[PDB]
Automatic annotation (TrEMBL), chain B:
The chain holds residues 3 to 681 of 960 of the full protein. It comes from the Bacteria. The lineage of its organism: Bacteria, Pseudomonadati, Pseudomonadota, Gammaproteobacteria, Enterobacterales. This is TccC3. The gene is TccC3. It comes from Photorhabdus luminescens (Xenorhabdus luminescens).
Automatic annotation (TrEMBL), chain C:
Transmembrane segments: none annotated. This is TcdB2. It is found in: Secreted. It comes from the Bacteria. The chain holds residues 757 to 840 of 1474 of the full protein. It comes from Photorhabdus luminescens (Xenorhabdus luminescens).
Length: 84, 1225, 84
């Protein structure tokens, strides 16, 4: 993560999106399994998908960009969309 | 159905990567006139007759040649990197169009119109100079990064160099072009036998390296300018500290969450700061910096804490002493109703989660619109929710700005609060500014407008209100008004409240507006055909609506007739002076060149003369370079002007219409390239003088302390020197000085030593000071002697009162109070002499339709003027219902002044009341009648005769009561449109002899000649010519760099009046020194408040020679009529000192005063200008001549219209005004 | 309260057959109509029609479409495809 300044993150349910505080860049949760699970077979094998994106969010590494920012700034949330 | 215009674009050839190597743009000619015209019902007979022109029937073939680099191999693929292009045009007639038109096979054929290798006009070529970050020498091929060093383009070839005519020798031209930065070279796509062309190089970049990411390090707009630089931030993604060639450096800090600069520092080290909210929207700004090395503003946030509210109501109610400006509140969600605590308590407290899970209630309590409607459709709706939503008083998405102008210790001026509402399409619905207490429209809680008004302290000026069609076009607009709220008013009630004023916009299927319907009671309308556009004004459409009977304007539209390149070639006007006659169809003709630029233009009068006498030239003739710059212009009325510019586009060498040679010295390419000086000479002079010189500031501490870095601080011109002492943080002059040249000195600012310039300069030097608020509004002003003004503003930032103290004196109130309409027009003004003016408006147009001035202590009406108008806006009548005035004998009521116009809105006639003894209008202003004279005033009428060229030729004046019957006869050249009175000549063949090469009139009357300077301002006028050793009575002037008059010097040479009347013009101060050649007779300092033509109040202060019947520190209040002409001048107690009526063309119709001593101090008269003793009144850039109505000289300003030498306001002096001369075009 | 309505008509569409895919509609007719709010104007911006013809790649239709065009006898000859 130190090699990059910006990050585009797709949340599949690993973190709460009903927070007043920002969602974590890196979390301990796990994606949520959707009700409408489905599969495709046109490639000769089953490709089954069980998840969908819940939110889309951007983070910027602010110390790499600025320099005077508190060390816990790699995962700094800038903006996000809620996909309900 | 027929005769469309048609164009076709044909790719002739392309490479394997699809790039257009060869391409032709085909413009087809106009189709042969058919038997049937499908639209004549609404046309004049001559619109069909004059619909066809040669310029509409040519086949125009514009051909492109091109090439691109392609870096293609196994490891790199970079395509489409252009390095060359050429454009040429072939022309053929209508007869050369192949049957069936043009297409690619016809064109690719060997013998086609462009395949046949015949000559064509070269329009230009361009080249790309590629680099590698090391060399300035262009690469044969580009790098992977396509780094471009610069762009080359053609500017000149022999057809454009010939355009310089005789203004420069060919030896000098070749030298000059290289000095000017042009390179003579070959063609990218040459043909056999072609000559070399000149190019300009621009857009220079020095690039960094891969390690720095491939970013620029240094750049220059052109080869001749200084390079500028910047610092890349640590990650080469952000620009830091841009820096000028002069060492002027800016600085900034970014909010890295948004990569958006938030802290900005200028070259004078002043600072601006904003912050951003969570979404990246700017929220409120702060500023600080120094003005005289001393810090001022709000400073940084830690010095004066402030937290922007999220609440619009709190914002509306915030206190004046905020340490911020432009405070923002955003409410984009206001359209979406929100759950209240009460409905929560009655329902959601137990069921919140059901509605939340049902996606009706949002995280913040807002109510979903689409999900809610679905909830209802599904029949799951709940009555507490239904009521909550139905009763939600939602407003369009909006925001509020709290505009402040306060700083430091001063919170005194109230915050300007503006709420703006947008629609759901991102368009602007309206905005309103909190205004002052007064009447306003009322509203109901459902946003329902009530037209009736009531007084309130809480009202906002609602403006720009617009309703849209959801494409973004207005379909309806509303007039401005005051509302006793800021909240948006429902569009439904606005439509219902018929008494409210609004306009309707009617569009065709394209979206072009074709009918405009106004509240005024009439409408505009237009017709489009492939060849012309017909603009029907209100007076024409008024014929259906059925004041001069609109039959006069029936079918008299203004019509634009186009060529087949989309340029306007004919301007067709229909001139009728009677509704029962035929129009004189007037067509202004225009010819475009091969580049589509105007080639030449001529009016109908000279056009027809030209047809029988071909030695008569156009009003305009033009020449252009290959980029379209106007290298040369020539006019039969105004002479020939030629200019050669630099690469940036600024002049280097120019020759005026009068032959004056001027040249400009700029800083070198290692420097910023700013102007340093201008030198000039007439053809007869061999050594030029430096008439302009600029001493530029750098980046030093002293310059920064006074905010002068990068500014020109010493400006030497034709009058003297202007010097900046200090600028404000708002960019205004905080302090400046000025010193003028001694009468006998010339502007020749040579050498490098200020001592010399100081010896050239007079010892009369002054400094003025100004105090500003944080937005730059003027709060106070100290003049050259020490007289001090103080201003007050309303919440909207408009002047709402004014005070003045003379040096050493107690402050006087000049304006007790001032207030405005929703449209910002003066509504009421209360003067310090206990005189009150009320302003009567027409809501339909928000036009001033009347002026009422009273002296409330005896409720005396001093004036009451009403203005009546036609459908377009020509005043057709003015009537003053007030008592005629104390200077009149046995007369109480003045007659209505009527005005008659023709179909072109020319003033044909006017009537009114004039002094019985006014006599002949001339250059000599009459004595006033005094009240003891028992003066008789009489009725008059005056008729204005215009020719076919739009020139005034005769003024027929009559007054049967005194038989003041005479005609002013204007003789106009029969070759040009130059004109003089019969006084100088009756012969149209000799009129031209009364003008110089540049169109400046040579003489006023026999014995009174006009001595013009090199720029066009009049240098000197002879008033009394004497012979042999006698000295002539003369008036001479000194003007500044912008033509502003600095001095008016009237020198009387008579042995019993050897006297100099010296008037110096200083901002807001007139220094009027009258002295005999041996002794001062009078010395008067006039300090003014406000502007002439805007009811300016003046105070007369004497240091010497005050008359026995004159008070010192005397206040003089000018009351102007609708056009700025001074109607009355009142004293400090509101009594009438004097009055004047004017003829429409600036003459004097009526003139009287209480005391001729007092009358002698009134100089501001017609349309706010002074009546110069010469009879030729100076307006910026030119002088007004009342017996002609066409001033004295021309201007380069006329272009596209095809206008003559000059005329006053398109001949409608009682409706249209142009005090600055900005109208011609 | 102002509302816009747009309605499209389709004609002459086609299927590829050989590569078995939908090719498109040879003719698309789009009408735009300004149903502006009552009480606003005495008249609405008159409606507009856009008539578009597209290549489908099926020459039978692409050629047939030539007779559906608005006609002008005084017009220039129309176009035909070019292969190179």
């Amino acid at each position: 993560q130190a090699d990059w300044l910006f990050y585009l993150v797709f949340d599949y349910g690993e973190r709460s999106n009903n927070l007043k505080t920002p969602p974590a860049f890196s979390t301990t949760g796990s994606w949520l399994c959707r009700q409408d699970r489905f599969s495709r077979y046109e490639y000769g094998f089953e490709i089954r998908t069980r998840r969908l994106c819940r939110q889309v969010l951007m983070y910027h590494h602010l110390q790499a960009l600025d320099s005077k920012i508190t060390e816990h700034n790699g995962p700094t949330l800038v903006s996000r969309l809620i996909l309900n | 159905a027929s005769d469309p215009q048609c164009s076709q674009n044909i790719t002739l050839s392309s490479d394997r990567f699809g790039q257009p190597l060869k391409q032709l743009s085909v413009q087809y000619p106009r189709r042969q006139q058919p038997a049937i015209n499908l639209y004549p019902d609404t046309l004049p007979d001559k619109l069909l007759a004059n619909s066809y022109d040669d310029q509409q029937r040519q086949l125009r073939l514009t051909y492109q040649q091109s090439s691109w680099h392609h870096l293609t191999n196994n490891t790199v693929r970079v395509l489409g990197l252009p390095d060359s292009t050429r454009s040429d045009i072939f022309t053929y007639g209508a007869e050369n169009v192949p049957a069936g038109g043009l297409n690619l096979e016809l064109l690719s054929d060997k013998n086609s119109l462009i395949a046949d290798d015949k000559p064509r006009e070269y329009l230009g070529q361009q080249k790309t100079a590629y680099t590698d970050g090391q060399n300035t020498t262009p690469l044969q091929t580009p790098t992977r990064q396509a780094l471009i060093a610069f762009t080359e383009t053609t500017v000149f070839n022999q057809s454009t160099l010939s355009a310089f005519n005789g203004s420069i020798p060919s030896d000098k031209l070749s030298t000059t072009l290289e000095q000017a930065g042009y390179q003579q070279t070959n063609y990218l796509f040459p043909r056999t036998g072609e000559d070399k062309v000149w190019v300009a190089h621009h857009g220079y970049t020095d690039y960094g390296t891969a390690a720095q990411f491939w970013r620029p390090q240094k750049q220059s707009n052109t080869q001749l300018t200084g390079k500028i630089t910047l610092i890349w931030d640590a990650n080469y993604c952000v620009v830091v500290q841009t820096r000028d060639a002069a060492g002027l450096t800016t600085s900034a800090k970014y909010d890295w969450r948004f990569l958006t600069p938030v802290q900005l520092t200028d070259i004078n080290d002043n600072q601006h700061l904003i912050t951003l909210d969570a979404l990246g929207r700017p929220i409120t700004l702060r500023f600080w910096g120094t003005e005289n090395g001393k810090m001022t503003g709000y400073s940084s946030p830690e010095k004066a804490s402030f937290s922007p509210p999220s609440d619009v109501n709190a914002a509306i109610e915030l206190k004046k002493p905020l340490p911020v400006a432009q405070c923002q509140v955003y409410a984009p969600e206001s359209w979406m109703p929100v759950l209240s605590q009460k409905t929560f308590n009655r329902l959601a407290e137990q069921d919140w989660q059901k509605l939340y899970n049902a996606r009706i209630i949002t995280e913040d309590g807002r109510i979903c619109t689409l999900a809610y409607r679905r909830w209802v459709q599904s029949q799951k709706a709940i009555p507490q929710l239904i009521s909550l939503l139905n009763n939600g008083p939602r407003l369009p998405p909006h925001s509020l700005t709290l505009t402040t102008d306060r700083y430091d210790h001063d919170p005194e001026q109230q915050i300007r609060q503006q709420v703006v509402f947008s629609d759901g399409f991102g368009r602007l619905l309206q905005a309103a500014a909190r205004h002052e207490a007064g009447m306003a429209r009322q509203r109901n809680e459902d946003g329902s407008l009530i037209i009736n008004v009531q007084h309130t302290e809480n009202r906002w000026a609602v403006t720009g209100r617009t309703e849209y069609d959801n494409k973004g076009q207005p379909i309806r607009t509303y007039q401005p008004y005051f509302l006793n709220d800021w909240r948006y008013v429902s569009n439904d009630s606005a439509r219902q409240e018929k008494e409210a004023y609004a306009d309707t916009h009617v569009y065709d299927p394209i979206g072009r507006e074709i009918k405009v319907i106004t509240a005024k009671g009439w409408f505009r309308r237009t017709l489009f055909t492939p060849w012309f556009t017909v603009n029907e004004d209100e007076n024409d459409t008024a014929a259906e609506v059925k004041n001069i009977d609109p039959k006069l304007y029936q079918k008299t539209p203004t019509v634009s007739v186009y060529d087949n390149r989309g340029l306007i070639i004919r301007n067709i006007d229909f001139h009728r002076t009677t509704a029962n006659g035929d129009p004189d169809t007037r067509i202004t003709r225009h010819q475009y060149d091969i580049h589509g630029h105007l080639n030449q233009s001529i009016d109908p009068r000279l056009y027809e003369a030209k047809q029988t006498n071909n030695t008569i030239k156009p009003n305009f003739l033009w020449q252009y370079d290959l980029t379209g710059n106007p290298l040369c212009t020539e006019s039969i009325d105004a002479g020939r002007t030629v200019t050669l510019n630099d690469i940036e586009g600024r002049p280097l060498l120019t020759v005026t219409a009068t032959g004056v040679i001027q040249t400009r010295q700029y800083e070198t390419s290692s420097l910023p390239g700013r102007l340093l000086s201008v030198a000039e000479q007439t053809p007869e002079e061999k050594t030029s003088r430096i008439t302009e010189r600029l001493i530029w500031a750098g980046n030093t501490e002293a310059e920064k302390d006074h905010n002068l870095a990068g500014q020109c601080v010493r400006h030497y011109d034709t009058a003297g020197v202007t010097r900046l002492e200090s600028l404000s943080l708002t960019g205004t002059v905080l302090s400046q000085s000025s010193q003028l040249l001694i009468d006998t000195q010339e502007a020749n600012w040579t050498g490098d030593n200020e001592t010399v310039w100081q010896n050239m300069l007079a010892d009369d030097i002054y400094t003025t000071l100004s105090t500003f608020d944080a937005t730059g509004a003027l709060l106070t002003q100290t003049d050259a002697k020490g007289n001090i003004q103080r201003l007050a503003y309303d919440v909207a930032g408009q002047l709402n009162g004014s005070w003045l103290t003379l040096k050493g004196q107690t402050e006087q109130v000049i304006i007790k109070s001032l207030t405005y309409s929703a449209a910002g027009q003066k509504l009421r003004e209360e003067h310090g002499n206990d005189v009150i003016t009320e302003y009567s408006y027409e809501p339909e147009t928000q036009r001033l339709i009347g002026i009422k001035t009273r002296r409330p202590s005896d409720t005396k009406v001093l004036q009451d003027l009403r203005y009546e108008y036609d459908p377009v806006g020509n005043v057709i009548s003015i009537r003053n219902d007030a008592e005629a005035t104390r200077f009149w004998h046995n007369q109480k009521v003045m007659p209505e002044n009527t005005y008659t116009y023709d179909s072109l809105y020319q003033l044909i006639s006017a009537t009114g009341r004039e002094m019985a003894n006014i006599g002949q209008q001339s250059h000599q202003f009459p004595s006033p009648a005094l009240p003891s004279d028992n003066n008789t005033y009489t009725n008059y009428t005056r008729t204005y005769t215009y020719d076919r060229g739009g020139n005034l030729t005769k003024i027929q004046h009559s007054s049967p009561a005194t038989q003041n019957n005479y005609t002013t006869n204007i003789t106009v050249s029969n070759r040009s449109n130059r004109a003089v009175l019969s006084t100088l000549t009756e012969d149209p063949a000799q009129v031209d002899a009364l003008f110089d090469a540049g169109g400046h009139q040579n003489t006023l009357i026999s014995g009174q000649n006009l001595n013009w300077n090199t720029r066009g301002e009049l240098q000197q006028v002879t008033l009394v010519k004497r012979d042999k050793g006698a000295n002539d009575d003369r008036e001479w002037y000194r003007y500044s760099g912008d033509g502003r008059r600095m001095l008016k010097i009237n020198e009387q040479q008579a042995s019993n009046n050897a006297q100099t009347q010296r008037v110096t013009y200083l901002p807001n101060l007139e220094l009027r020194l009258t002295q005999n050649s041996t002794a001062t007779t009078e010395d008067l300092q006039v300090i003014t408040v406000g502007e002439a033509g805007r009811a300016q109040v003046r105070v007369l202060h004497w240091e010497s020679g005050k008359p026995e019947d004159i008070d010192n520190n005397q206040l003089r209040y000018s009351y102007d009529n609708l056009i700025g002409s001074s109607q009355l001048e009142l004293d400090s107690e509101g009594q009438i000192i004097s009055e004047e009526e004017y003829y429409p063309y600036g003459g004097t119709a009526l003139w009287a005063a209480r005391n001729q001593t007092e009358a002698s101090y009134k100089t501001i008269r017609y349309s706010g200008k002074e009546r110069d003793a010469t009879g030729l009144y100076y307006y910026g850039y030119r002088y007004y001549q009342p017996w002609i109505g066409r001033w004295l000289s021309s201007a380069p300003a006329g272009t596209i219209d095809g206008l003559n030498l000059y005329r006053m306001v398109r001949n409608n002096p009682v409706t249209l005004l142009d005090p600055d001369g900005l109208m011609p075009t | 309260g102002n509302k816009l309505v747009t309605t499209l008509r389709y004609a002459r569409g086609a299927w590829d057959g050989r590569e078995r895919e939908f090719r498109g509609f040879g003719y698309v007719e789009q009408t735009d109509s300004h149903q502006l709010a009552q009480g606003n104007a005495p008249e609405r911006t008159p409606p507009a029609l856009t008539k578009n013809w597209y290549a489908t790649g099926l020459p039978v239709i692409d050629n047939a479409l030539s007779t559906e065009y608005w006609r002008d006898d005084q017009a220039f000859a129309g176009f035909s495809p070019r292969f190179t």
